[PDB]
Structures are given as structure tokens and as C-alpha cells.
Amino acid sequence: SAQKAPKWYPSEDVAALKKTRKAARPQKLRASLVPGTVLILLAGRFRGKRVVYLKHLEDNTLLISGPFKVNGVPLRRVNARYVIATSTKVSVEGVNVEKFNVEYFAKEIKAERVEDQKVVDKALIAEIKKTPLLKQYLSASFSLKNGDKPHMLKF
Amino acid sequence: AESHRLYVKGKHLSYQRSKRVNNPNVSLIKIEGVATPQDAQFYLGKRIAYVYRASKEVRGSKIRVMWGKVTRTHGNSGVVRATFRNNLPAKTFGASVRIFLYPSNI
Amino acid sequence: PSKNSINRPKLTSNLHHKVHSLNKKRAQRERAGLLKPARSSVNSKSGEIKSVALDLYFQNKKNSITTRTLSKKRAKKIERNLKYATQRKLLV
Amino acid sequence: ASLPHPKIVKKHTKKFKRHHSDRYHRVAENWRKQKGIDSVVRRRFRGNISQPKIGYGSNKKTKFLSPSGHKTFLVANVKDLETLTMHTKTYAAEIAHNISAKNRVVILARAKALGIKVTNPKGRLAL
Amino acid sequence: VEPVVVIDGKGHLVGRLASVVAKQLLNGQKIVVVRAEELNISGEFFRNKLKYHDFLRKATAFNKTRGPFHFRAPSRIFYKALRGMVSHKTARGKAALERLKVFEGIPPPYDKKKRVVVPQALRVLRLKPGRKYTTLGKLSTSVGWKYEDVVAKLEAKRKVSSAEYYAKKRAFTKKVASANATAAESDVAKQLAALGY
Amino acid sequence: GIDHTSKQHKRSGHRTAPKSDNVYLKLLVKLYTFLARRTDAPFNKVVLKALFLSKINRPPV
RNA sequence: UUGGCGGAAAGGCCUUGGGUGCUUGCUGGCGAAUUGCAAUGUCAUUUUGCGUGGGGAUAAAUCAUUUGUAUACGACUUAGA
RNA sequence: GCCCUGAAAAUGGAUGGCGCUCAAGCGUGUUACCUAUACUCUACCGUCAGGGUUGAUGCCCUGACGAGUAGGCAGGCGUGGAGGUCAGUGACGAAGCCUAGACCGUAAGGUCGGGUCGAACGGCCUCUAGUGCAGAUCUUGGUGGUAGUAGCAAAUA
RNA sequence: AAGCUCGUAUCAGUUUUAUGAG
RNA sequence: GGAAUACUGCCAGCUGGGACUGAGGACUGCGACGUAAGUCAAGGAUGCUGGCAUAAUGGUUAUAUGCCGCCCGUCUUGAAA
RNA sequence: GAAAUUGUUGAAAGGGAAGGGCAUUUGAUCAGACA
Ligand SMILES: [Mg+2]
Ligand SMILES: [Mg+2]
Ligand SMILES: [Mg+2]
Ligand SMILES: [Mg+2]
Ligand SMILES: [Mg+2]
Ligand SMILES: [Mg+2]
Ligand SMILES: [Mg+2]
Ligand SMILES: [Mg+2]
Ligand SMILES: [Mg+2]
Ligand SMILES: [Mg+2]
Ligand SMILES: [Mg+2]
Ligand SMILES: [Mg+2]
Ligand SMILES: [Mg+2]
Ligand SMILES: [Mg+2]
Ligand SMILES: [Mg+2]
DSSP: SOOOSSSSOOOOOOOOOOOOOOOOOOOOTTTTTTEEEEEOSSSSSTTTEEEEEEEEEETTTEEOOOOHHHOOOSSSSEEEGEEEEEEEEETTTTTOOOSSSSSHOOOOOOOOOHHHHHHHHHHHHHHTTTSSSSHHHSSSSSOOOOTEEEEEOOO | OOOOOEEEEEEEEEEESSOOEEEEEEOOOETTTTTTTHGGGGGTEEEEEEEEEEEEEETTEEEEEEEEEEEEEEETTTEEEEESSSSOTTTTTTOOEEEOOOOOOO | OOOOSSSSOOOOHHHHHHHHHHHHHHHHHHHHSSSSSOTSTTTTTSSOOOOOHHHHHHHHHHOOHHHHOOHHHHHHHHHHHHHHHHHHHHOO | OOOOOOOOOOSSSSSOTTTTTTTTSSSSOOOOOOTTTTOOHHHHOEEEEEOOOOOOOOOOTTTBBOTTEEEEEEEEHHHHHHHSSOTTTEEEEEEOOOOOOOHHHHHHHHHHHTTTOOOOTTTTOOO | OOSSEEEEEETBBHHHHHHHHHHHHTTEEEEEEGGGGGEEEOOOHHHOOOOEEEHHHHHOOOGGSSSSOOOSSHHHHHHHHHTTTSSSTHHHHHHTTEEEOOSSSSSTGGGGSBBBBOGBBBHHHHSOOOOOOOEEEHHHHHTTTHHHHEEEEEEEEHHHHHHHHHHHHHHHHHHHHHHHHTTTTSSSHHHHHHHHH | OOOOOOOOOOOOSSSSOOOOOOHHHHHHHHHHHHHHHOOOOHHHHHHHHHHTGGGGSOOOO
């Protein structure tokens, strides 16, 4: 015997957790996040690009589109904390986004993405064409210049 | 365009300290364009990155990052306090850091 | 800076040269292969027995100036223990 | 595959070294209390070494636990090994330093059959 | 926000300029100081000369070559005033000091660069009118600096060249302003005025 | 800091446990500890207290 | 590629003539996606390394010997195809 | 009230230094700001106290405390030898020694890997003592710097 | 440190009231 | 004569931003919204998602940087002195 | 076949001592956990 056996042994019956009193409640977005708003992307592959916010998804994400014909950003999800909501707004009542959801964006090109992109971008472009220089504004990328102060800049 | 910058520039001033002892767990950061605590309140909670270069490649890059965040203001002149996951080396007193715009309240 | 030439940087230039020299020396050692490989490499010894005597014995079986030598006594003991392990492997 | 435990916290990971054990070869690093009446270390002046005390004591629910979450139990043979046949999730067996390779083979085989984790399964068994 | 800040030292008070520059160097800003011979010290010339002569008294008795070194040039006087405010025996202090260059006059290439001022160190903004002050070039010449005339001649030549450059620049600016002022009635100009530009 | 009015970490005392190694005496102490806790009987309290005394404090009768 | 200027540490400033691109001054058409909801997500001169190659030029210093205007020893000052 | 004189020696030096003149000086007022092992909240260690309880000097719940020389009390770590036990370890390698490797203890220490080594040694319950070193101008033995240094120049060669 | 008792028990580097001293 | 405002104070008024913490581990209790079954922020954190799956986090070791740190024992009020 | 002390090799530091504490960078090196 290289070591004496202990007199007492802890039990291996793992106890269950106590009943947690933490209910899940819907997210309250910022007052500036209204569908149809132009958003600046702050991070990711499409950082510094201006897109259009379309729909709030069940996973606390925002459905956005470029539109893909204007600046090459497809129908994607974004996190609301990584965007800047500007003041520019376009109408979205002509856009049908009742199909897209988390199950749609699950990843376990399919060309159903392409078809839905064409259908959504048609109405988005129709709404965009009414405002002058809005298409050029959405195609241009955002960046900070010398001496820009984000705590003073309006959006 | 000619610029792609999505961050504000800052300088790592020093550690939190008294006259004869310092606390490396807290760093003092001076953000460009900020001169008052009222203006510094905008940047609370923003991510800070210290980006530096090393000669040996690690995971496909020669560029290494130390992450942290803004926690509170400091003084009357727009200096803030920041905490990083690993404390800054203290050879970086006077070096540049990047204050990002996320998480965003705008 | 030096009191004889205050406009010329001295300490920063010395540190920059030192950093550059250390980087070049490390790169030269890596290219010479004097550094341990990655942990997931096939030739990594991570989590395994590290023994100069066993490494020398197996290098001699496979077939500059070094301080790593294998004694005849240890080599004979290695051969004997390898015969024991081979007999066990044959039995199972 | 151990018992669930809180995150292990060590209050003082660094070793408590004896004063001037760096200064003199004849002074070993094993901790000794300074009994001098004028000792700056004993009087606890700023800038000196820290001394062991009960405040540094570890959490009783994480005490004696290895990083894998087990308690180490030294074993010399199969009979010592089979003491842990029911306390598998809390204890891991460690073979004693003086067990021969021929017996370590048997111990490892029996431990694998019984599902008992072995702390040092590579000892003396290089191929 | 400039990578290098060039400060015209004329009309500044030495102590306050030294304080602000030392803080900038510690924060990690590269600074060049020009025209150090035109710096000012508050107080009378005899007082400042007396203070420098006390400094001259200070020396190591058993070997003068080990003692305090008394550099006579105005740039070196300013450098002493700043080294007294930088913790210069540490690596951090040495690194801060190595972000600083001080010159008498404006040598190249800084003669063709923009030069700024520090309002909190300016004499006309700080000192009460009527208080006496001292010029660093005269003080340095009285304590042994021997290059005041050479610097004056070179500065005069530089001023002539800079005046010619400014005359050409002012003519071009007048031409540009004339060409811009005639387009203030266009619809583009009206839209820019509506947007504030 | 605090200005303590009384001593700190003061033991109550009162002869908690017997100093003997008699296993039968320890069994009797166990039984009367149980009785004194679960009966609220002053007799059981007195007997339990007397079982802790030393030889010079338990004179014969 | 034409010419002028700049010596404070000039090493930069201005200018002539074609060439070759770009131009968001204005109007259009195609492309972007999957980096999967963020992870610096790598973007800037110089390279005493090599390979290709057209050209350019073919030295000294020290030891040893030697002098004494030099010298404790080094050092110094001379001479030798 | 502030300012100047209102006495001073002897290496070169001090509002701590730089320096500061509508001050960065003096008197006062109003705010903001910096930070102690102090105060407040939380976690963890230990001690003490109060309750509960048919490995019970254990377990569970709650609360408050923690400076220390001489001195007191308590719990522990380590060593030689002895009785008992593990039908303990060991020539497939005991003890010892070395170790840029691993782990557990607040600590005294304990455990594992590798190398060297070549015959004995350990865990636990107890017994016993010539049982723990940094010092004593300590004892014995061994070894440095000084240092290739001082010097090996009386007695004619 | 040990016993015995008692435990709205025993009190207190404090105040108050009455009464002295200055 | 009619108001407003400043100052001081109160609300068991509403609401935005930031930081540290998540101890406990079946149920029991006190409450709230509810006719109702039930629900809840009420006797201590859960839910959703991404990347990596190894030297990446982490440890050790050699050093660098910022700040702190006088040589121990003994004996003397007291010792750098 | 220990230490003091020494040689060689490799790595590192060094502008009038070195050593220690807290924290992190860099170089080197390494264990666990891998269903
Ligand atoms: Mg002179
Ligand atoms: Mg306390
Ligand atoms: Mg002051
Ligand atoms: Mg005042
Ligand atoms: Mg052995
Ligand atoms: Mg003895
Ligand atoms: Mg000794
Ligand atoms: Mg002693
Ligand atoms: Mg001695
Ligand atoms: Mg000699
Ligand atoms: Mg003779
Ligand atoms: Mg690390
Ligand atoms: Mg100190
Ligand atoms: Mg021998
Ligand atoms: Mg040795």
C-alpha cells in the first residue's frame, strides 16, 4: 500500500440545479431603429457600407439588404450593436420580407437566395429612385476624416 | 476612398497611480478630440485595441492585438480609464490605441 | 540622448537595432531547425516520454560537436527492455 | 469526465521563497519565518516578500483537486487500484514512482477495464 | 494632429513652453523648436544674468571636467529647462527626450514648413504690460555664446527669401479669390450656402 | 478599524468534551448528549455535565 | 525631358515640351453574396539575400626589419621591392 | 497689509528639482477632480459564538471578528531506531544524486516524469530519541577573488 | 488556567438629579 | 394688482448610457399580476450565437519596461548614522 | 559521486554594482482537456 484509503468518500450523485427564475423577454430596440432606415456597418466583411434595415428577427438580429444591385451587400443578418442608425429613411411597405428567418439563414449559392434578392431589390430600388443622390449615397462607403469627432457628429 | 478608418485615435498615457505606487490593472487613455468628461461619456463601454507588430508569424499574421474596453472617465480633461484582458506592457506609455465605435448606442 | 549631440536619437536607435538583430537571429535558428516543432506535428514529442538516451538509441538504430552521448550500459538495458516489450507484444 | 466543480481559484500561485535564499547559496528556499526583532520582512515594510498566512487558504470545494477535477490517489498494485472502482468521477489513480514497468502494464490494463483515470500512464512504458 | 509639430520659439516664455513641450513629449508627440534665440524670460536682464552666474558657480571642486556642464547657447538653455522637467535618467525619459529637436534660427528643411505657437506660453498673453523681460540671445551672448551675429545674418537672408515666396503666394491667392468670387451666383454655390459650405 | 468593547474570539469553555479514552464512557456520553438534547430534562443536563468531570472532581460516595 | 534657384544641416523649390493612363463635371449597363451576426482581419518606403543580366575600377593596412625629432610597455616619428 | 534694510563667512548646491511674476507668490471664496492595508457591498480562508441533527470531537444553518516583542495555548511537517500490519515496493531496476518537465498543500513539506545509478527500501497504527542550523572571531575538511600579481636584485663574472 | 455558584446577575475612564468645593 | 421664475425640500414619478459581481444548487417562504387555470424581475444567471480545438488561452523560464525595495544576525532608547 | 569553485558549447543582458516584489510584452519551452 502506497497510500491509505480515506475513511469517507464523497458521493457521485450529481445534484440537479435549482429552478431558475429568469424568463426570456423580447428585446427593446433603440428608438432610431425603424424599418426602412439607412444603417452604417461598423464591423465585418462589409464594414463602412450603407445598407437598408428591413426586419427585426427572432434571434435579436436585424435583417438588412444592400440592396445587392446598388452596393453588393446581400440579404444578411446584423447585430444591432454593430451598426449606426442614420436619419435617412426609405419606404418599406412595398417590400415583402415575411419569408426570411433564422431557419432561412441557417447554414447546417442556393439560387433561392438569388431569386429572393432580385425580388426584394426590385422594390427597394423602386423606393430609392425617388430621392436624388440616394443611390450614389448608398453606393459610397463611410469613413472618418481627419478631425472627425463621433461624439459631435449627427447621423 | 483615401481613408478607411472606423476608429478614433488614442494614446496610452500611463497606469492608474498615486505618487509612489501604480496599478497596472487600469490604464489611462487620452482620446483625440475629447477635452471634457461630458464628451468622454460618449465613449464609455467602447472597445479598445492595441495593435502591434511581431516578427514571428502566429496563426497567419505578424500583427497581434490586445483587447480591452473603456470603463469610466478620469479627471477634468477628457482622459478615460480602460481595462484590458491582459494589462498593457508599460513600454507603451505614449503609444497609439484604437477606440472602436461598437457597441453602438447611435 | 548624449550631452554632446542632443538632436540625434541614441537610445531608440540602439533599441531598434537590438530588436532587428534578435529577430534575425531567431529567424536563422528557425531555418537551421534548432527549435522544437509545433505541438500538432507528427514529429512532436508533446505528451510523450522525452529521453536523450532513447532518442540517441533510435537514431543509432535508424542510421558537428555535441554533448549528448549514450553509454553501453544504458544501450544494453534498452535492448533488453525492448526484447521484453517485443515478447509481450507477440504474446498479445 | 469528472464531477462538476466551480472554477478552480488559487489565491497565490507563486512560490513562497525564504528571505535571502537568492542572496546566499547556504540559505535554502524552503520557507522559514524571520524571527529577528529588526527584520523588515517580519515587520512587513513595503516592497518586501509576502509571507504565508491563512488568508491565502484555498476554497474547500476546490481543495486538493487536480486541473482535471480529480483527487490524486497513489496506487502500488491492482488491489490498491481497485479501491477506486466506485469513486471513479472523484478520484484519479497515480502509479507510485517505484513500480516496475512489468507491473505498470498490468495496472494500466486493469485501470482501463475498470474505467479509472490514470494520472501518469506514460511512465516507464516508452516503445 | 501633425506627425511633427514645429514651434516658433519667438515670444514664448521659457518655463511655460518647457512645461508644455515636456508633457507633449511624454505623451508621445514629436516636436521641433526653432528660433530659440528669441525666447523670453520674465524679469530683468541683470536678474537673469545673476541666476546664470550662480549656475556658473556650480562646479565639481576636485575635477571640473566631471562637474555640471554649462552650455551657453539659447537652445541648450531651453533644453536644460526642459530636461529639468523630464525624468531623464529612465528609459522612458530618454525616449521622450529623443522626440525633441531644438535649433537656433530656422535651418532646412524647417524653413519651408508650417510653424505654430503655444498661446499659454506667449509673453503678450501671459505677462502684465509693463513688466520687464529678458531676451535669450542677449543673455547667451553675455554668458559666452559666440554665434549671435552669424544667426542674425542667416535669418535675414531667410527672411528675404520667405518674403519673396509670400509675395508670390499672395498674388496667387488673390487670383484664386477673384476666380472663386465670380461664381457665387451659381445654383451650386446657392446649394452649398444653404448647406453651410 | 473598530474600538472593541470586549475581548475577541473568546472561548465559552464549560468542559465541552471528556479527556478520557474509555470507549464505554464515550458511549455513555453519547447517550446522555442525545437525551439532554431531545428531552429538555434538567436531570439529563446534570448527568451529562457530571460525566465530563475529572477524578479529583468526582469524589466517591 | 527643358531651364532656373537653393550651402545653416543645401539633398529640396519652381518650371518647359510631348508621351502614356485616370477623371465622380453629367448620363447609363454588367459584377459583388457563403469572411455565414464581430474578431488589426493583415493593403504604406526601404531591402549590405539571391537569380537575370547591359556597363564601370583593378588597393592598402598591420606584424616582422629599420630611424631617434619619440619612448617604462604600448604609442610616436622615419626608411626599405 | 505687502515690499526693501533689519550682518554674513570660508569645496559646488538647493522652496525636493525644473522653473514660475494680472504666478506655478500671499489672503480669501465657490466648485470640479486625484487617491490609503480607512469606510460601504460581494466572494473566499481561518477563529469565536448561537441554533439544528437516531466520516457524532462529523454534517447543516446563521452572525461577528482577524496588528503584535517577551510569554501562553493548540493543530500540524520532517529524521535515526523499535512492535504490528499492508501475504507493501524492488535486477522489466531499491536507496542516493542531477533535472529549461508536471501536480497538490497558506506553510513545514508531499507526489509524478526524464537522466544517472546498481541493492535494498516505504505507506499506515503505535513505541523511542544523540531528531530539524545562517550565524557562535564555532569544529574538521575542501575552495575562491586577490593573481600569473608581490616577487625569485647581499656574497664583483 | 481550573473549579463552584448566580445570570433583568453584575456593573460602567459617561451623562442627569440632589448635595459640597472653589 | 395679477402672475412667472430663482432657492430649498419631497415623490412608494418616468426613462437612457457605463463598470464589477452570478455565491447557492430538487421542492418548501414572503409576495405580485390574475375570476380562473396559471404566470412572474418574488429565499443568489439564464437564453441565443460565433470562432478555435491548439501552444490559441494558460503555466514555467530568460530578459525588457513602469513603480516600489538599504545587509543580515546580535546588543543597545535608538540606529543609515 | 553533492556543493563551493572551474573549462567548453548554446542562449541572453550589460552608458559608475547585482540581487528582490507587483504587472505585462517579447523569445524559448511545456502539461492538462480532446468527444
Ligand atoms: Mg570658455
Ligand atoms: Mg478588521
Ligand atoms: Mg506644486
Ligand atoms: Mg489662492
Ligand atoms: Mg531508482
Ligand atoms: Mg544534538
Ligand atoms: Mg553552516
Ligand atoms: Mg540565528
Ligand atoms: Mg567563521
Ligand atoms: Mg614581476
Ligand atoms: Mg651577486
Ligand atoms: Mg500568454
Ligand atoms: Mg526607493
Ligand atoms: Mg567513482
Ligand atoms: Mg557546481
